Every structure is written in C-alpha cells, then in structure tokens.
Nucleic acid binder design. Structure first.
Length: 64
RNA sequence: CUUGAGUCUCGUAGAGGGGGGUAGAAUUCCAGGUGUAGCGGUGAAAUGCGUAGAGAUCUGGAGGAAUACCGGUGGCGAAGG
C-alpha cells in the first residue's frame, strides 16, 4: 500500500446556495452565512480575524 | 337708536378637551432549533458577555412603553400646552 492523497477525495455537504446576513455594527462587523431557511451554516467576524477593538470596526477589517 | 355689545340661522377649518377602542412597526425579554468561538466598550479599554454553547441567524411565545412617514416659522388650545 502506497501513501494517501494530498487533498480529500470526498466531501460531506454540497448545499450550493445560501444567504449572507451581515450585522455591520458600530464597533465591529459580524458576517454569517445561513441556508435559505435561516439555519446558520458558518460564520466569521472582524474582531476574530486578527483585529482588536481599535481596528475591528473598519470596512477593511470587515472585508477580511 | 343700532352702529358698540350680544344672539340664532347658515357656511367652515382645525395635533383643542374628556371617555373608550385598535393596527402595525420596533427596542426588550423567555423557550427552542441551526451553528461554533467568538462577543462587547472606549481615544485605549477596563469592568462586562462566551464555549455550563455566546455573537449571528431562524421560528414559537411573552411584556410594557411609544407612535417612523406626514411636518411646515403649518394647524389647533386660556395659558400650561
């Protein structure tokens, strides 16, 4: 038996479609993609994307 | 005496008052789903909120307060309003 592949041969969902809900808040920005029924599938933030209080409120921090 | 003053007829606009009712919108709160480690507050944060499952997103339920637009040096009330 040889060594295994570098990248996965299979993937557990393929839901194709969703809605990005943004709460661009006065001190931060929070972005969440949810399926069309509003059950959330995955998310990320300004402040969690490597910015503290002083930077997390900017469109450049939100862009990331 | 009718001219001041008063009165009815009649035309008429009004967020004027008191009593009651109502629709939708929203901030909040509760439950639960989905999801997953972030959230928050300031000049900076700190205090504070999270993984005992937050934030964000969906749906059910709950409360109490107030009427966005219209809106104008506009209209109405003795003034307070």
């Amino acid at each position: 038996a040889k060594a295994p592949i570098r990248a996965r041969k299979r993937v557990r969902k393929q839901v194709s479609d969703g809605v990005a809900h943004i709460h661009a808040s006065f001190n931060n920005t929070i972005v969440t993609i949810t399926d069309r029924q509003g059950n959330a599938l995955g998310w990320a933030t300004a402040g969690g994307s490597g910015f503290r209080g002083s930077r997390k409120s900017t469109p450049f921090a939100a862009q990331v």
